[PDB]
Amino acid sequence: SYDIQAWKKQCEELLNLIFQCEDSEPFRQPVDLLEYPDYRDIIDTPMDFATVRETLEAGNYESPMELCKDVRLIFSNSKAYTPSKRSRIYSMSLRLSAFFEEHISSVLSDYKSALRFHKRN
Ligand SMILES: O=C(Nc1ccccc1Cl)N1CCN(C(=O)c2ccco2)CC1
């Protein structure tokens, strides 16, 4: 497809699949700073899947690359906060990241292809 707008619905669908994954539980909503009092000493930019979905539905992503940068920030924040590479919540993050990367690959390729076709002449 050379549809320049198709990525948006494709990302809505993929966020729906991520919300059905039990591995997304810890990442749907912001970290609570009463249960994790040192979070903002470690993490400069919090991110979660509900913020990603709201930013998409507001029309505040210009490309699936921007959405991808914010989802990758969810996963790098988990890696930066984990006291161990064997922790439950970090382990959930690695499986969810693999799922996300497997599915976003074609969304990015199709978008970049569609832009190149738009500028073909
Ligand atoms: O509290 C968290 N998420 C959450 C938010 C609202 C309701 C319910 C939940 Cl589980 N989080 C814990 C901190 N964290 C980590 O990535 C991490 C890595 C090693 C330990 O925690 C991010 C998710």
Query: 12: how many CB neighbours lie within 10 A of its CB?
Result: 12
Residue tagged 């249960």 (tokens): 35
Residue type, 51: T
Residues 6+ apart with CB under 8 A from 44: none
Q: Write the secondary structure of the chain as one string of H (helix), E (strand) and C (coil).
A: CCCCCCHHHHHHHHHHHHHHCHHHHHHCCCCCCCCCCCHHHHCCCCCCHHHHHHHHHCCCCCCHHHHHHHHHHHHHHHHHHCCCCCCHHHHHHHHHHHHHHHHHHHHHHHHHHHHHHHCCC
Nearest to 11 by CA among 79, 100, 85: 100
Nearest CA to ligand 1 atom 5: 31
In whole angstroms, what is the distance from residue 119 CA to residue 100 CA? 29
PDB experimental method: X-ray
Resolution of this entry in Å? 1.1
CB 114 within 8 A of CB 4: yes
- 35 Cα: distance to centroid of ligand 1 (angstroms): 9
Q: Which atom of ligand 1 approaches the CA of 87 most closely?
A: 19
